[PDB]
């Protein structure tokens, strides 16, 4: 259902994924301890993504399958979409300076939303305990 708050607690491979994006020390560290409180809010076709992380309290929002352009803090351009496979939400995010591709598997269990993250061959699970 998604509809609700999320607050990452434990991760799983997320440290190495930042080494992939080209993040060194403080950046991947700040990305981890961020406290990404996601306040998911589905209206109908759009999915707001409140993100009270260390970077900024920015609602994201991304109509399912609507290719958009989202600048990151240290990741830069990331254009791509999210689509409900039926059982998982997949955050496909390419880049403008090259057009490769990054993906993101939102594996909701029940009480936890895990968002993996691959920019090729380095996953990064960001376990959320909802709330
Ligand atoms: C330099 C590190 C910053 C990147 C990682 C922490 C902040 C997240 C960046 C934007 C992600 C939000 C847009 C997609 C929604 C999501 O991540 O679930």
Swiss-Prot record:
Biological process, per Gene Ontology: fatty acid metabolic process; fatty acid transport; intestinal absorption; intestinal lipid absorption; long-chain fatty acid transport
Documented effect of changing residue 75 to V: Reduced stability
Binding site for tetradecanoate: 82, 106
Outcome, altering residue 121 to V: Large reduction in stability
Modified residues (N-acetylalanine): 1
Pfam families to which the protein is assigned, alphabetical: Lipocalin (PF00061)
CDD domains membership: FABP2
Keywords carried by this UniProt record: Acetylation, Cytoplasm, Lipid-binding, Transport
Gene Ontology terms for molecular function: fatty acid binding; long-chain fatty acid binding; long-chain fatty acid transmembrane transporter activity
Tree of life domain: Eukaryota
Inducing factors: By peptide YY.
Mutagenesis / variant outcome for changing residue 97 to V: Reduced stability
Effect upon mutating residue 80 to V: Large reduction in stability
Xref: InterPro entries: Calycin (IPR012674), FABP2 (IPR031272), Fatty_acid-bd (IPR000463), ILBP (IPR031259), Lipocln_cytosolic_FA-bd_dom (IPR000566)
Residues reported to bind hexadecanoate: 82, 106
Transmembrane segments: none
One cellular-component annotation, GO: microvillus
Location, primary (coarse class): cytoplasm
Tissue specificity comment: Expressed in the small intestine. Expression in the mucosal cells of the ileum extends from the midvillar region to the villus tips.
Localization (cell): Cytoplasm
Result when mutating residue 60 to N: Reduced thermodynamic stability
Known function: FABPs are thought to play a role in the intracellular transport of long-chain fatty acids and their acyl-CoA esters. FABP2 is probably involved in triglyceride-rich lipoprotein synthesis. Binds saturated long-chain fatty acids with a high affinity, but binds with a lower affinity to unsaturated long-chain fatty acids. FABP2 may also help maintain energy homeostasis by functioning as a lipid sensor.
Protein family according to the UniProt entry: Belongs to the calycin superfamily. Fatty-acid binding protein (FABP) family.
Domain notes: Forms a beta-barrel structure that accommodates the hydrophobic ligand in its interior.
Identification of the protein by name: Fatty acid-binding protein, intestinal
Species whose genome carries this gene: Rattus norvegicus (Rat)
């Amino acid at each position: 259902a998604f509809d609700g708050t999320w607050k990452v607690d434990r991760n799983e491979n997320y440290e190495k994924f930042m080494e992939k994006m080209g993040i060194n020390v403080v950046k991947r560290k700040l990305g981890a301890h961020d406290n990404l409180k996601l306040t998911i809010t589905q209206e109908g076709n759009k999915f707001t993504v409140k993100e009270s992380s260390n970077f900024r309290n920015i609602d994201v929002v991304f109509e399912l399958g609507v290719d958009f352009a989202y600048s990151l803090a240290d990741g830069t351009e990331l254009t791509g979409t999210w689509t409900m496979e039926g059982n998982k939400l997949v955050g496909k995010f390419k880049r403008v300076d090259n057009g490769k591709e990054l993906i993101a598997v939102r594996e909701i269990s029940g009480n936890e939303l895990i968002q993996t993250y691959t920019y090729e061959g380095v996953e990064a699970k960001r376990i959320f305990k909802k709330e």
